[PDB]
């Protein structure tokens, strides 16, 4: 409610969009995070979309769109423990039970 009321003003700079984000994460709903993933994964910066990846990856999973999740992950940093997890389900999710 209070990023909402927040956001009434007007559509401003980061750091003000990752927390509804996050609430909506948090809450479960993934459909509304997607929506508002797709709106604006373009229209932002790279260190931001780097931000924004792996809630992309989650809500994608959420609604089963591997084709969506391999081209999200594919920017998470590597040293990122998350970041290997995700890759990790992305690759056992399409039978490569080597890596």
């Known amino acids: 409610v209070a990023y ?5 003003t007007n559509k401003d700079d980061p750091e003000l969009m990752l927390g509804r984000m996050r609430c909506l994460e948090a809450l479960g709903e993934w459909g509304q995070l997607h929506q508002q993933c ?17 809630m992309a990856a989650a809500a994608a999973w959420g609604l089963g769109q591997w084709d969506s ?7 998470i940093p590597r040293d990122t423990h998350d970041g290997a997890f995700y890759r990790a389900v992305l690759a056992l999710h399409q039978d490569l039970f080597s890596l």
């Open 69 to 75: 999740m391999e081209e999200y992950t594919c920017m």
């Open 4 to 8: 909402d009321k927040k956001m009434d």
């Open 38 to 54: 797709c709106e604006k994964w373009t229209l932002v910066n790279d260190e931001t979309q780097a931000k924004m990846a792996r």
